[PDB]
Scaffold this motif. Structure first.
Motif, PDB file in Angstrom:
ATOM      1  N   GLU A   1      58.699  89.102  17.254  1.00  0.00           N
ATOM      2  CA  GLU A   1      59.076  89.028  15.820  1.00  0.00           C
ATOM      3  C   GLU A   1      60.566  89.345  15.695  1.00  0.00           C
ATOM      4  O   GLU A   1      61.276  88.614  14.966  1.00  0.00           O
ATOM      5  CB  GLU A   1      58.241  89.998  14.991  1.00  0.00           C
ATOM      6  CG  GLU A   1      56.748  89.693  14.991  1.00  0.00           C
ATOM      7  CD  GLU A   1      56.306  88.320  14.503  1.00  0.00           C
ATOM      8  OE1 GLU A   1      55.401  87.729  15.136  1.00  0.00           O
ATOM      9  OE2 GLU A   1      56.833  87.858  13.481  1.00  0.00           O
ATOM     10  N   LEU A   2      61.032  90.383  16.395  1.00  0.00           N
ATOM     11  CA  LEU A   2      62.452  90.808  16.330  1.00  0.00           C
ATOM     12  C   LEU A   2      63.336  89.699  16.909  1.00  0.00           C
ATOM     13  O   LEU A   2      64.401  89.402  16.302  1.00  0.00           O
ATOM     14  CB  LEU A   2      62.618  92.144  17.057  1.00  0.00           C
ATOM     15  CG  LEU A   2      62.104  93.372  16.300  1.00  0.00           C
ATOM     16  CD1 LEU A   2      62.282  94.643  17.118  1.00  0.00           C
ATOM     17  CD2 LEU A   2      62.805  93.531  14.957  1.00  0.00           C
ATOM     18  N   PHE A   3      62.916  89.073  18.016  1.00  0.00           N
ATOM     19  CA  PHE A   3      63.647  87.923  18.611  1.00  0.00           C
ATOM     20  C   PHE A   3      63.693  86.774  17.606  1.00  0.00           C
ATOM     21  O   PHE A   3      64.786  86.216  17.450  1.00  0.00           O
ATOM     22  CB  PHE A   3      63.070  87.486  19.949  1.00  0.00           C
ATOM     23  CG  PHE A   3      63.659  88.201  21.142  1.00  0.00           C
ATOM     24  CD1 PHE A   3      65.042  88.296  21.310  1.00  0.00           C
ATOM     25  CD2 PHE A   3      62.832  88.777  22.099  1.00  0.00           C
ATOM     26  CE1 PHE A   3      65.573  88.960  22.403  1.00  0.00           C
ATOM     27  CE2 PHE A   3      63.369  89.449  23.186  1.00  0.00           C
ATOM     28  CZ  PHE A   3      64.741  89.542  23.335  1.00  0.00           C
TER      29      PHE A   3
ATOM     30  N   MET B   1      67.301  85.429  16.120  1.00  0.00           N
ATOM     31  CA  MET B   1      67.674  84.034  16.458  1.00  0.00           C
ATOM     32  C   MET B   1      67.900  83.250  15.164  1.00  0.00           C
ATOM     33  O   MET B   1      68.971  82.625  15.033  1.00  0.00           O
ATOM     34  CB  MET B   1      66.600  83.365  17.307  1.00  0.00           C
ATOM     35  CG  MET B   1      66.629  83.790  18.766  1.00  0.00           C
ATOM     36  SD  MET B   1      65.205  83.091  19.677  1.00  0.00           S
ATOM     37  CE  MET B   1      65.449  83.905  21.250  1.00  0.00           C
ATOM     38  N   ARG B   2      66.964  83.338  14.215  1.00  0.00           N
ATOM     39  CA  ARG B   2      67.126  82.712  12.879  1.00  0.00           C
ATOM     40  C   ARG B   2      68.509  83.079  12.320  1.00  0.00           C
ATOM     41  O   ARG B   2      69.279  82.165  11.987  1.00  0.00           O
ATOM     42  CB  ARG B   2      65.994  83.145  11.950  1.00  0.00           C
ATOM     43  CG  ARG B   2      65.874  82.268  10.713  1.00  0.00           C
ATOM     44  CD  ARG B   2      64.731  82.577   9.779  1.00  0.00           C
ATOM     45  NE  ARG B   2      65.155  82.370   8.389  1.00  0.00           N
ATOM     46  CZ  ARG B   2      64.550  82.870   7.316  1.00  0.00           C
ATOM     47  NH1 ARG B   2      63.443  83.590   7.434  1.00  0.00           N
ATOM     48  NH2 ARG B   2      65.059  82.633   6.120  1.00  0.00           N
ATOM     49  N   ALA B   3      68.827  84.375  12.237  1.00  0.00           N
ATOM     50  CA  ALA B   3      70.080  84.854  11.612  1.00  0.00           C
ATOM     51  C   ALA B   3      71.276  84.296  12.402  1.00  0.00           C
ATOM     52  O   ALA B   3      72.223  83.809  11.769  1.00  0.00           O
ATOM     53  CB  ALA B   3      70.094  86.358  11.551  1.00  0.00           C
TER      54      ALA B   3
ATOM     55  N   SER C   1      70.357  93.810  19.476  1.00  0.00           N
ATOM     56  CA  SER C   1      71.612  93.631  18.707  1.00  0.00           C
ATOM     57  C   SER C   1      71.944  92.138  18.605  1.00  0.00           C
ATOM     58  O   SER C   1      72.026  91.485  19.665  1.00  0.00           O
ATOM     59  CB  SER C   1      72.734  94.385  19.364  1.00  0.00           C
ATOM     60  OG  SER C   1      72.470  95.771  19.319  1.00  0.00           O
ATOM     61  N   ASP C   2      72.162  91.645  17.385  1.00  0.00           N
ATOM     62  CA  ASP C   2      72.589  90.250  17.116  1.00  0.00           C
ATOM     63  C   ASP C   2      73.883  90.274  16.297  1.00  0.00           C
ATOM     64  O   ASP C   2      74.136  91.278  15.645  1.00  0.00           O
ATOM     65  CB  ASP C   2      71.473  89.471  16.426  1.00  0.00           C
ATOM     66  CG  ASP C   2      71.107  90.005  15.059  1.00  0.00           C
ATOM     67  OD1 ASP C   2      71.992  89.960  14.194  1.00  0.00           O
ATOM     68  OD2 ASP C   2      69.917  90.469  14.870  1.00  0.00           O
ATOM     69  N   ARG C   3      74.674  89.209  16.373  1.00  0.00           N
ATOM     70  CA  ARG C   3      75.872  88.967  15.531  1.00  0.00           C
ATOM     71  C   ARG C   3      75.497  87.892  14.512  1.00  0.00           C
ATOM     72  O   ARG C   3      76.176  86.882  14.456  1.00  0.00           O
ATOM     73  CB  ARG C   3      77.081  88.581  16.387  1.00  0.00           C
ATOM     74  CG  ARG C   3      77.638  89.733  17.219  1.00  0.00           C
ATOM     75  CD  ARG C   3      79.148  89.881  17.257  1.00  0.00           C
ATOM     76  NE  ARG C   3      79.983  88.763  17.698  1.00  0.00           N
ATOM     77  CZ  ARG C   3      81.004  88.246  17.005  1.00  0.00           C
ATOM     78  NH1 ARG C   3      81.352  88.728  15.820  1.00  0.00           N
ATOM     79  NH2 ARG C   3      81.690  87.232  17.507  1.00  0.00           N
TER      80      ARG C   3
ATOM     81  N   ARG D   1      71.024  97.349   0.576  1.00  0.00           N
ATOM     82  CA  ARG D   1      70.113  97.306  -0.591  1.00  0.00           C
ATOM     83  C   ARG D   1      68.882  96.445  -0.276  1.00  0.00           C
ATOM     84  O   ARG D   1      67.820  96.741  -0.869  1.00  0.00           O
ATOM     85  CB  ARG D   1      70.888  96.764  -1.787  1.00  0.00           C
ATOM     86  CG  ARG D   1      70.150  96.756  -3.122  1.00  0.00           C
ATOM     87  CD  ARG D   1      71.063  96.371  -4.282  1.00  0.00           C
ATOM     88  NE  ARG D   1      71.838  95.164  -4.012  1.00  0.00           N
ATOM     89  CZ  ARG D   1      71.430  93.917  -4.227  1.00  0.00           C
ATOM     90  NH1 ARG D   1      70.251  93.682  -4.772  1.00  0.00           N
ATOM     91  NH2 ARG D   1      72.215  92.896  -3.918  1.00  0.00           N
ATOM     92  N   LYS D   2      69.003  95.465   0.631  1.00  0.00           N
ATOM     93  CA  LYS D   2      67.951  94.455   0.907  1.00  0.00           C
ATOM     94  C   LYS D   2      67.173  94.773   2.196  1.00  0.00           C
ATOM     95  O   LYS D   2      66.217  94.025   2.499  1.00  0.00           O
ATOM     96  CB  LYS D   2      68.601  93.080   0.996  1.00  0.00           C
ATOM     97  CG  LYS D   2      69.216  92.548  -0.291  1.00  0.00           C
ATOM     98  CD  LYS D   2      69.891  91.174  -0.073  1.00  0.00           C
ATOM     99  CE  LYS D   2      69.854  90.190  -1.233  1.00  0.00           C
ATOM    100  NZ  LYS D   2      70.741  90.598  -2.351  1.00  0.00           N
ATOM    101  N   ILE D   3      67.516  95.849   2.918  1.00  0.00           N
ATOM    102  CA  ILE D   3      66.735  96.264   4.124  1.00  0.00           C
ATOM    103  C   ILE D   3      65.290  96.500   3.683  1.00  0.00           C
ATOM    104  O   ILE D   3      64.407  95.899   4.291  1.00  0.00           O
ATOM    105  CB  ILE D   3      67.385  97.466   4.860  1.00  0.00           C
ATOM    106  CG1 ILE D   3      68.525  97.030   5.787  1.00  0.00           C
ATOM    107  CG2 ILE D   3      66.389  98.248   5.698  1.00  0.00           C
ATOM    108  CD1 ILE D   3      69.664  96.302   5.096  1.00  0.00           C
TER     109      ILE D   3
ATOM    110  N   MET E   1      55.413  91.898  -0.137  1.00  0.00           N
ATOM    111  CA  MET E   1      55.561  91.165  -1.432  1.00  0.00           C
ATOM    112  C   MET E   1      56.680  90.111  -1.335  1.00  0.00           C
ATOM    113  O   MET E   1      56.516  89.037  -1.932  1.00  0.00           O
ATOM    114  CB  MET E   1      55.859  92.126  -2.586  1.00  0.00           C
ATOM    115  N   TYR E   2      57.755  90.351  -0.576  1.00  0.00           N
ATOM    116  CA  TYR E   2      58.694  89.272  -0.133  1.00  0.00           C
ATOM    117  C   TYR E   2      58.030  88.408   0.958  1.00  0.00           C
ATOM    118  O   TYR E   2      58.115  88.722   2.166  1.00  0.00           O
ATOM    119  CB  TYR E   2      60.059  89.859   0.248  1.00  0.00           C
ATOM    120  CG  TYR E   2      60.975  90.101  -0.930  1.00  0.00           C
ATOM    121  CD1 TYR E   2      60.917  91.282  -1.668  1.00  0.00           C
ATOM    122  CD2 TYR E   2      61.911  89.146  -1.313  1.00  0.00           C
ATOM    123  CE1 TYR E   2      61.763  91.509  -2.742  1.00  0.00           C
ATOM    124  CE2 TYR E   2      62.760  89.355  -2.390  1.00  0.00           C
ATOM    125  CZ  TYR E   2      62.687  90.540  -3.104  1.00  0.00           C
ATOM    126  OH  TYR E   2      63.529  90.745  -4.156  1.00  0.00           O
TER     127      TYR E   2
END
Ligand SMILES: O=C(O)CCCOc1c(F)cc(-c2c(C(=O)NCc3ccc(C(=O)O)cc3)noc2-c2cc(Cl)c(O)cc2O)cc1F
Ligand SMILES: O=C(O)CCCOc1c(F)cc(-c2c(C(=O)NCc3ccc(C(=O)O)cc3)noc2-c2cc(Cl)c(O)cc2O)cc1F
Lengths: 365, 362
Positions: free
Chosen positions: A248-250, A254-256, A286-288, A295-297, A304-305
Motif C-alpha cells: 500500500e505504501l509503495f 509511486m502514484r505521488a 521516502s519519496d520525492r 492539514r490533509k494528513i 470517509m475520504y
C-alpha cells in the motif's frame, strides 16, 4: 429492502450473537502462536479453542456492526457483510456438540474455516462500497465520520485477528500428518528477511504502476543493523502482514512520484531504510512525490475520504503492538514509517476492547 | 488592602481575543495606533493574566505551596496590579501612553525568569511529593497551557514596547515589532546552528557540520522568505540543534568525523516545513512521548523544557513540531509553519469549566 436481515433472524442468529458477545476475546502472544504450531500442540486443542474463540470474536464485532448509525447499517453492502458474518457464525455453531476424538470432525472443521476464509475475501471493498453508498445518499457531516472511523478501525482490526487464527489452523493442519521441519509456523516466518518482503511488495507495486502509468520509480534499500553492523536483518513476523503494509505504501509513493513528474525523464527513486535497534524494527519509505500539507494528513488516514490501504496498513502494524506514522513536506515528498517490535516476546495481539460500560465512572481527589 | 482576587475573578469571566499575523502587521507607529493598542492591551493583558492565574489557583496543593510556584504567582499579581493602575487613565494624554509602555517593559523584565522558576517549582514538587502518574498528566496539561499563555503575553508586550519605544535610529527598522515580514528562514537556521555549535564545542571538543537544502516549490531558484517572528523560529531551531548535536556526539564519543546535521527547508502552497535530520542513533518509539514531558526532561547541552516549549512556539501560530526517530540510526525533527500570514492566528489555551475540571479527575 430487508430480506438478508429477515433471513438472519429466522435463522436464530441473534440468540447466538447475544450469547457469544457476553465473553471477551483471548489475545494470543507471538510465542503462543509459535508453540501452538510446534508438534507438541494438537489439532484437538486448536479445535476446542477456535470453536469457542472464533464465535466470540465474530459475535463481538457483529454486536458492534448493529450499533452503527441506521443510515449506514441499512446500506445494501453493509447488510451483505453482516449476512456473511451470520452464515460464518452459524457454520461454526454446527461444531459445538461434535466429538474432538473423531478425526472426521477435525477434517470438516478445517474445511469450514477455509469456506469462512474464502467467504470473507471481499469484505474490505464491500464495507467500503457501503460507506460510499452512505456518503453519496446523505451528507459528509464530520460527527458521523469520526463514528464510522472509530467502528471501521475496530472492525478491520477484529477481521485481521480472525483471519490470523483461521490461517494458523488451516496452514498447520492442512489434512495429513506432515514432515519434520516446516519453513513457517502457519503464516509466521520465524526467520523473516525484512528486505526480501520489501522487494516483493515493490515488485507487485511496480507491476501495477507500469500497467496504469507506463513509468515507475526504482527502489534503493539501505539496512542498519545497530547491534550487528552489516548482518542481514531478520525477525519473527507474518510476512503477508508486512507485505500488505509495504504494498500500500509503495502504491501511494509511486502514484505521488509519477503524478508530480508528468514532464520528467528521470523519476526520483523510492528510498527504503530498514533499521533494527534493541526494541524497534523501523522501515522508512521516502519519496520525492511533492508531499501533502499537514492539514490533509488526517484525511489520508480516513475511511470517509477503496482509499483504505493506509488506515488498514496502520491496523496491521498495531495488531502486533507496532505503529505506522506518515510525515510529509509539502513541495518536496513524504516519509512513511512502519514501527515493529524487534522481539517476539513484545508481540501480543492488540484486539478491540469490547463490553466496556456506556456508564462512565466519575473521579475525585 | 490590595484586591488581587477581586480583579482575578472579574477578568477571568472573559475569553482571550486571538489576533492574526495580519492584525499584528497592520499596526503602524501612529499616536492613533498607540491609543488603539493601549485601550486593547489594558483589557486583553489582564484577561490573559487573570485566566492563567485562576488556573494556577486550581493546581493540586502539593504544587501550589512550592516556593517557586508561589513566587511566579506573586509576579503575576504584581503585573496584573501594575496594569490596573491604567484602567481609568485617559488615552488622549501623551504621558499615560508613555507610563504604560514603561509599565509593560517592567512587566517584560519581571517575567524573564518565569520558565526556569516554574521548572524549579516542578522539581520542588517531584523531590518532595514524588511521581504518582495522575498528578504528572495534571502538571503536563497545566504546563502546556501556562507556557502557551506566556508566549501569547510576551508577544503582545513585545509588539507594544518595540513599536512604541520611541528611539531615533532603531536596531531592526525592517521589523513590525518582533515580526520580520521578509524573514529569511535559512539565515535563522545558520544563527541557531552557530550558537548550538558554540555550546557543543564548549562541552565536547567536536560538533557536527550543517548542510542546508531549500525547496521553493512554486519559484524554484528563489531564497525562502516568510512573515514570522525570528526569535520564535530561533528558539525552536536552537533547541532542536542542541538535542541533535548531543545525540550525534554521545553516539560517536570516540569519532573524529561526526555525521553532519541535515536541514531541509521546503515551501509549498500552504506549509513551510523545516526538517532537521541527525545520525544520533535514535530513540525507541515508546520513549518519544517522554521527550515531550516536563516531568522526565531535566536532560538526563541539556535544558529539558526545550522540546515541549519549542512545540508550543510552533503551535502558537497554527504550526506543529513533530519528531520521528529510527532506533539504531537517527532522528528527524520537523517544524511545520503556515506559509501564508492570513492562516497564522494565535492558538491560546481554551479557558472553561471542562479545561478546569482536569484538576479534579482521572
Ligand atoms: O485518499 C485516501 O484516503 C488515500 C489514497 C492515497 O492517494 C494518495 C497518494 F497515492 C499519494 C498522495 C501524495 C501526495 C500528492 O502529491 N497529492 C495529493 C494532494 C492532495 C492535495 C494537495 C493540496 O491541497 O496541496 C496536494 C496533494 N504527496 O505525497 C503523497 C503520499 C501519500 C501517502 Cl499516504 C504515501 O504513503 C506516500 C505519499 O507520497 C496522496 C494521496 F491521497
Ligand atoms: O532539551 C530538550 O528538549 C530535551 C533533551 C532530552 O535529551 C535528549 C537529547 F538531547 C537527545 C536525544 C536523542 C537521542 C538519544 O538517543 N539520546 C540518548 C539516549 C539513547 C537511548 C535511549 C533509550 O534507549 O532509552 C535514551 C536516550 N537520539 O536522538 C535524539 C534527539 C532527540 C531530540 Cl528531542 C531531537 O530534537 C533530536 C535528537 O537527535 C534524547 C534525549 F533524551
Amino acid at each position: 429492502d430487508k430480506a438478508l436481515l429477515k433471513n438472519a433472524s429466522l435463522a436464530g442468529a441473534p440468540k447466538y450473537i447475544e450469547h457469544f458477545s457476553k465473553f471477551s476475546p483471548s489475545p494470543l502472544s507471538m510465542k503462543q502462536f509459535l508453540d501452538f504450531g510446534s508438534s507438541n500442540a494438537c489439532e484437538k486443542t486448536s479445535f476446542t479453542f477456535l470453536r469457542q474463540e472464533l464465535p466470540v470474536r465474530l459475535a463481538n464485532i457483529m454486536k458492534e456492526i448493529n450499533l452503527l448509525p441506521d443510515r449506514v447499517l441499512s446500506t445494501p453492502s453493509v447488510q451483505l457483510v453482516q449476512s456473511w458474518y451470520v452464515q460464518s457464525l452459524l457454520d461454526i455453531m454446527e461444531f459445538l456438540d461434535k466429538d474432538p476424538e473423531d478425526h472426521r470432525t477435525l477434517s470438516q472443521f478445517t474445511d469450514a474455516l477455509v469456506t469462512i476464509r474464502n467467504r470473507h475475501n471481499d469484505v474490505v471493498p464491500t464495507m467500503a462500497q457501503g460507506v460510499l453508498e452512505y456518503k453519496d445518499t446523505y451528507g459528509d457531516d464530520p460527527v458521523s465520520n469520526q463514528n464510522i472511523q472509530y467502528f471501521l478501525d475496530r472492525f478491520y482490526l477484529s477481521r485481521i485477528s480472525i483471519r490470523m487464527l483461521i490461517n494458523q489452523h488451516t496452514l498447520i493442519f492442512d489434512g495429513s500428518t506432515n514432515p519434520a521441519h516446516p519453513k513457517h509456523i502457519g503464516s509466521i516466518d520465524p526467520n523473516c528477511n525484512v528486505s526480501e518482503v520489501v522487494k516483493d511488495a515493490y515488485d507487485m507495486a511496480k507491476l501495477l504502476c507500469d500497467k496504469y502509468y507506463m513509468a515507475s520509480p526504482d527502489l534503493e534499500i539501505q539496512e542498519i543493523n545497530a547491534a550487528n553492523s552489516k548482518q542481514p536483518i531478520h525477525m519473527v513476523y507474518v510476512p503477508s502482514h508486512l507485505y500488505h503494509m509495504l504494498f500500500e505504501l509503495f502504491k501511494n509513493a509511486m502514484r505521488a512520484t509519477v503524478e508530480s513528474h508528468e514532464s520528467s525523464l528521470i523519476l526520483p527513486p523510492i528510498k527504503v531504510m530498514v533499521a533494527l535497534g534493541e526494541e524497534d524494527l523501523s522501515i522508512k519509505m521516502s519519496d520525492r512525490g511533492g508531499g501533502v500539507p499537514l492539514r490533509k494528513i488526517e484525511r489520508l488516514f480516513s475511511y470517509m475520504y477503496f482509499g483504505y490501504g493506509l488506515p488498514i496498513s496502520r491496523l496491521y502494524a498495531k495488531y502486533f503492538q507496532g505503529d505506522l506514522q506518515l510525515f510529509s513536506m509539502e513541495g518536496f515528498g513524504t516519509d512513511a514509517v512502519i514501527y515493529l517490535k524487534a522481539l517476539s516476546t513484545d508481540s501480543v495481539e492488540r484486539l478491540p476492547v469490547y463490553n466496556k460500560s456506556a456508564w462512565r465512572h466519575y473521579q475525585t481527589i
